[PDB]
Write a protein that binds this DNA or RNA. Sequence first.
DNA 1: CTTGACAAAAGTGTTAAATTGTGCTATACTGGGAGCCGTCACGGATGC
DNA 2: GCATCCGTGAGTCGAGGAAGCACAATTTAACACTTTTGTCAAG
Lengths: 350, 338
Amino acid sequence: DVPSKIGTLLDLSATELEQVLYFSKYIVLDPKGAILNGVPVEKRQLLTDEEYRELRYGKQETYPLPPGVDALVKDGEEVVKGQELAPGVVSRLDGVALYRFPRRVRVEYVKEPKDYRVQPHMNVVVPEGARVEAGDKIVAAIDPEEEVIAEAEGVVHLHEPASILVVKARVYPFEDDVEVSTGDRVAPGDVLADGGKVKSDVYGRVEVDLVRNVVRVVESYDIDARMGAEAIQQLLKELDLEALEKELLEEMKHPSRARRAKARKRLEVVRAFLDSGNRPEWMILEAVPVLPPDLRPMVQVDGGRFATSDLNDLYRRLINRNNRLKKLLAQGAPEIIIRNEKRMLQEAVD
Amino acid sequence: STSDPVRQYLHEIGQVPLLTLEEEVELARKVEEGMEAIKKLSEITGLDPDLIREVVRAKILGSARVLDPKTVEEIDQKLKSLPKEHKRYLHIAREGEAARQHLIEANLRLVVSIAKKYTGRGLSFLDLIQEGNQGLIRAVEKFEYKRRFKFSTYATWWIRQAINRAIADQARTIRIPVHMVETINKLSRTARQLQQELGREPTYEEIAEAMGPGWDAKRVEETLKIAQEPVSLETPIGDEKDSFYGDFIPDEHLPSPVDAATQSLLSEELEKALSKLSEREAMVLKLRKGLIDGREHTLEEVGAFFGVTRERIRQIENKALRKLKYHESRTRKLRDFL
DNA sequence: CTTGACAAAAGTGTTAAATTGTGCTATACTGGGAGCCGTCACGGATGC
DNA sequence: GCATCCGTGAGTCGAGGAAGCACAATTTAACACTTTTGTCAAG
């Protein structure tokens, strides 16, 4: 309803409100010391999906090497932007380079560059440059008949990666048990493993690689950004109408007529809530009233046929979508699915 | 498109690259390994396997998701207090839980391709996609990579099943059980085949014969009567949309002014007729016929109020009923109400 | 007013159908589909 | 100032009314029996 009451109180444009309410952009509620492109992130800032993903999960990219070729970089070596990983592929961000699926493992027996072939249904169980005593497993497979083990002692070398993963992270080697787990979030100075011998020096998401027995901290921030009416209700609950009115009144003395014209429009809405006793967050619905059944009847006509009102169909859609969202939340469904369900629930209420 | 929910959803699912053969196998193996690791964790700590998986899932999904968080943090700490050999299963559980999320997110195009073939059957395109997504989540739970079958071959079964069950459960205002929905669909197919073979609409006898044993013309007709959707009360009638079905349907629940008055007139006349009776005879009839408390009392219950035996109450009521009959005959002021 | 037969008149309790809810299929399948189009007034809001 | 956009408004009565199956779980139906209730004649 132009001009929107929610937008006027929160100072959001018609487009900005729609983007948040229908899950197109994020709105920052707690930057958590997040920096985006060299600038600190500030509260009430709108983030696109790519910006949120970069801030919340970091920067990484996978480059598929052509079959047969061998990369010019080793597993676990830092790269810079523009560096050539393989003979024909060049990275676009600096970070740790990781072999995704090594197609050939070349062990060096001591008495001998024996080689073994790696297939998609097989996975290597040892890191690069590892000494293998005669008998230890090297490449695992579904069928033990094709499983690969080491006849004698040697050094395992991995070659021919299926693709190269460039991840902006910090690699922390460890020897004893790690005090963190995959998915945990850490801040500088937090202990990672070995009783404080290894500690985080940057924000990020901690992921433990047991094959490489290292701790990777994917540089990222624990920023609090949300979409939909849950974010808007968070802003509307935080409003101090007393404080907002005082600021608006001060801006009512600005020389410009447009500034005072806008301030009057905002303060008229602020005054309405202050005088009536209503709360701004009541403009977001948590419980939806249901009309009495006799005002939306499902009646049997003289011929025995049933006639019903349109409100029953609109209620059924909202209930079906609400129930489905509860099931998806109980299943721990990915964020993409949940966002679609929440966006559909908002539309069903509308 | 901000205005188009479907275009917005397609763009979002297009931001996750498709999985290759090697990528799919590792994700499936990690999911399989994580579930085995979770089962071992429950055995070692004795905790409920569901609780362990929920705690692991909460840690992976992060703090952006609304058992309170403190209990999760407590179970997380207890798991992390295990020795290194037992912490290895916790690491495997976390990796497997993350793999489950990426395997699901990478196959959201598969549901859309399957779901576009089910439109026009009562559910909207986005409703079909979300129901299909639920089958895709179920497929990841049961998919077995040891069999060397690709994910789409096994997942397509669950995606279709979820969409079809959703249609059977949500496509009608008056829900018909799934088994009855199957009967309706089969009957429509049989009639359509007969119609294209007889060069006309088949009768119930032809449809019943083609359906098989246990079917007759009566059953075919009752099933067709069962499958009639309600009509909208707001459907327009006429070229100018100012009249609707609801404007022509009378209300037959509330009594009419004429019905209410005749009920009140009868009560007044019956009250006067009961005046000619004795003080106790009127009470007996009013108690037995439910003219006082609203509900009929019995001879024994009536006797309980008055302290008389069951047989006597029956006779006194009968005499009073005979009295009233005599009065009515001599006046005939109460026969019109019958 | 009782006082004992009586008989349905009704209710309680199992049991077996009949109905209904639910899980499951293993070649590989991976981003939709329908508008299309002859009116004219006003505010009011924003793109600036 | 300014276009361009969207949103709201445009007479009254009347007459026309597309899986299939398996199996488990729940509900409905049909007995069975006992337990009121209603009459009876008395007494």
